[PDB]
Design an enzyme around this catalytic site. Structure first.
Site, PDB file in Angstrom:
ATOM      1  N   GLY A  74       2.311   5.890  10.214  1.00 13.98           N
ATOM      2  CA  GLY A  74       3.601   5.909  10.162  1.00 13.98           C
ATOM      3  C   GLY A  74       4.343   4.746  10.456  1.00 13.98           C
ATOM      4  N   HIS A 128       0.746  -1.208   0.062  1.00 13.33           N
ATOM      5  CA  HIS A 128       0.093   0.110  -0.052  1.00 13.33           C
ATOM      6  C   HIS A 128       0.747   1.390   0.122  1.00 13.33           C
ATOM      7  CE1 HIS A 128       0.118   1.170   4.121  1.00 13.33           C
ATOM      8  NE2 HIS A 128      -0.092  -0.016   4.688  1.00 13.33           N
ATOM      9  N   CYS A 167       3.394   1.471   9.661  1.00 11.64           N
ATOM     10  CA  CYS A 167       3.341   0.631   8.699  1.00 11.64           C
ATOM     11  C   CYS A 167       4.760   0.107   8.231  1.00 11.64           C
ATOM     12  CB  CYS A 167       2.577   1.027   7.306  1.00 11.64           C
ATOM     13  SG  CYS A 167       0.869   1.516   7.746  1.00 11.64           S
TER      14      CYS A 167
HETATM   15  O1  QC3 Z   1      -4.695   1.785   8.978  1.00 11.80           O
HETATM   16  C1  QC3 Z   1      -3.694   2.617   8.345  1.00 11.80           C
HETATM   17  C2  QC3 Z   1      -3.801   2.699   6.906  1.00 11.80           C
HETATM   18  C3  QC3 Z   1      -4.406   1.642   5.892  1.00 11.80           C
HETATM   19  C4  QC3 Z   1      -5.720   1.904   5.508  1.00 11.80           C
HETATM   20  C5  QC3 Z   1      -6.664   0.961   4.965  1.00 11.80           C
HETATM   21  C6  QC3 Z   1      -5.699  -0.116   4.404  1.00 11.80           C
HETATM   22  C7  QC3 Z   1      -4.494  -0.333   4.755  1.00 11.80           C
HETATM   23 CL1  QC3 Z   1      -3.550  -1.812   4.344  1.00 11.80          CL
HETATM   24  C8  QC3 Z   1      -3.835   0.663   5.518  1.00 11.80           C
HETATM   25  C9  QC3 Z   1      -2.573   3.002   6.640  1.00 11.80           C
HETATM   26  C10 QC3 Z   1      -1.848   3.593   8.130  1.00 11.80           C
HETATM   27  N1  QC3 Z   1      -2.826   3.114   9.041  1.00 11.80           N
HETATM   28  C11 QC3 Z   1      -2.359   2.963  10.369  1.00 11.80           C
HETATM   29  C12 QC3 Z   1      -1.856   1.787  11.005  1.00 11.80           C
HETATM   30  N2  QC3 Z   1      -1.392   1.689  12.125  1.00 11.80           N
HETATM   31  C13 QC3 Z   1      -1.833   2.464  12.967  1.00 11.80           C
HETATM   32  C14 QC3 Z   1      -2.583   3.708  12.741  1.00 11.80           C
HETATM   33  C15 QC3 Z   1      -2.957   4.564  13.686  1.00 11.80           C
HETATM   34  C16 QC3 Z   1      -3.705   5.634  13.179  1.00 11.80           C
HETATM   35  C17 QC3 Z   1      -3.972   5.958  12.073  1.00 11.80           C
HETATM   36  C18 QC3 Z   1      -3.722   4.889  10.919  1.00 11.80           C
HETATM   37  C19 QC3 Z   1      -2.865   3.976  11.225  1.00 11.80           C
END
Ligand code: QC3
Ligand code: QC3
Ligand code: CL
Lengths: 302, 298
Positions: free
Chosen positions: A143, A41, A145
């Site tokens: 951040g 992603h 990820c």
């Molecule tokens: O959940 C996601 C986003 C996402 C959305 C849809 C699909 C994918 Cl594979 C990824 C990418 C960043 N992220 C986060 C990852 N971990 C913690 C987080 C905390 C607060 C905001 C975001 C966060």
């Protein structure tokens, strides 16, 4: 003596963390030999996140679109390929700090250490379990990820998790290092939810054995139980069924403490019925389920 | 989201761990520049008398599969300093710092000079640490990381009869009224680190857990009366000031959060949990909460 939630020393994994930038997106990558692994992603904007065709988005990219940074050194991307939900960025330099490693896919109930990273820099290390609903109760901000989960039994690092997503309940979803998600999750912004979570029964029993080894016996009782009656009670408290595999796995702890697995199961049934009554077990007022039978043996014996 | 007991990345400290053998005793040492620091009980008591009888070659120092040559030895309080011929090429930027009770640090537990685990913990108000150490863990170190500098604050020396641990700063001064000798020693009555519990309540608010909040506030004097009754450390004006940023971020004044804590102490949790805990957690400082809920890196 003592029982702590213990993570593996993170040094071998720290020397692998890099920053991966693609357009506006910046996340973490794992640099092993001449390949940088990261969530696919990274090629998405956030607008094309609802229904991304990753093959279509990836074919439009060239190597120079991926900016990889290892400390204060920019690595040169010489190739790219996608394997399931991970992007593999072939770079022109092999990581000299590459440890002895393996990619291992774990089962629910297994534990691992997470090296949380932001901008390719490690910020913390904590211990996790893969929940029965395939999520992890991590501590991750935007951040993070590409941060990885691992075990370091002996001198080999077994990579078992790469962080991809946070679900609406604040729990986390990710993949093994081959890009296969744990659980029925997809790397897109479609409505997804963690399934109802359950307690990892075999881990709670291992933690009760850890408490016995540490001198605590208050919760023990004169009763035993059949495996079936234990499960009939366990299910009512949202505890995972205890299998004959789990009973077998608990054998060494049973032999060390002199308390048969089904005898410890009857203690667990009683604890579920009564609560703790102002008492604690290993400094906890809740039944701990993020220590496997293997973790208990390692920490209590060496 | 999420709140975990998080340790600092241990890599900079792993590159410093060595095995120190003297006679029958094998324990861990910290190799920084050309000196290996380890507990003086490895010689073992009249430690000056025992040390004067030892020669450099009696100390076998092993850094991985490489034996270091000891060229000198000296004692500083309860720490033995073994001068070696080779400076550790992996020596990070470091400082020796003595911490105060309530401060937290990461422990890199080691056996035979090899790091086996890393965990977070706090220096209890009774100067013990509730660690996880087996025989062979002596010389394992506690540290914090400030930007790129490792601050060494603890070296493990012993286990008390209650299963808790006692050790020194890196200058060999024990934390607490302990001595490095086999004798009757007991951890004093422990208390709860109040400022840390409040920081953890702010961490729960930042994570969406507000059930414990109430409309009430309290004076610092009335809170300290309640706190003393429940074996909680007194909350000072320094602690109130230190909690300022979290108070500004959540909109809950420190004395407002103190009134939540008072109600929790008098009435309990009532079957509820805070951050997945049924007990009030006191091993996160206000700085740990800010660092984790804002993602600072090393
Ligand atoms: O959940 C996601 C986003 C996402 C959305 C849809 C699909 C994918 Cl594979 C990824 C990418 C960043 N992220 C986060 C990852 N971990 C913690 C987080 C905390 C607060 C905001 C975001 C966060
Ligand atoms: O407490 C001690 C011994 C000791 C004896 C007299 C003086 C001193 Cl300074 C230290 C040396 C090893 N050790 C331990 C240290 N940490 C954990 C342990 C766990 C289980 C058994 C022992 C342990
Ligand atoms: Cl597994």
């Amino acid at each position: 003596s003592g029982f702590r939630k213990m993570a593996f020393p993170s040094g071998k994994v720290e020397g692998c963390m890099v920053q991966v930038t693609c357009g506006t997106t910046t996340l973490n990558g794992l640099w092993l030999d001449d390949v940088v692994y990261c969530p696919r992603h990274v090629i998405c904007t956030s607008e094309d996140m609802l229904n991304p065709n990753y093959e279509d988005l990836l074919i439009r990219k060239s190597n120079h679109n991926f900016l990889v940074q290892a400390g204060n050194v920019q690595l040169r991307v010489i190739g790219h390929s996608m394997q399931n939900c991970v992007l593999k960025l072939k770079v022109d330099t092999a990581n000299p700090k590459t440890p002895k490693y393996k990619f291992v896919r774990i089962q629910p109930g297994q534990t691992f250490s997470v090296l949380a990273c932001y901008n390719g820099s490690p910020s913390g290390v904590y211990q996790c379990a893969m929940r029965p609903n395939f999520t992890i109760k991590g501590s991750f901000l935007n951040g993070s990820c590409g941060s990885v989960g691992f075990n370091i039994d002996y001198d080999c690092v077994s990579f078992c998790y790469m962080h991809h997503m946070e679900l609406p309940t604040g729990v986390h979803a990710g993949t093994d290092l081959e890009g296969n998600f744990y659980g029925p999750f997809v790397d897109r912004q479609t409505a997804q939810a963690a399934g109802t979570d359950t307690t990892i029964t075999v881990n709670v029993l291992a933690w009760l054995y850890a408490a016995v080894i540490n001198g605590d016996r208050w919760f023990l009782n004169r009763f035993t139980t059949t495996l079936n009656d234990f499960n009939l009670v366990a299910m009512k408290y949202n505890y995972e069924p205890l299998t004959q595999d789990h009973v077998d796995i608990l054998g060494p702890l049973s032999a060390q403490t002199g308390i048969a697995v089904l005898d410890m199961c009857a203690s667990l049934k009683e604890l579920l019925q009564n609560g703790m009554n102002g008492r604690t077990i290993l400094g906890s007022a809740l039944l701990e389920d993020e220590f496997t039978p293997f973790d208990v043996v390692r920490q209590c014996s060496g």
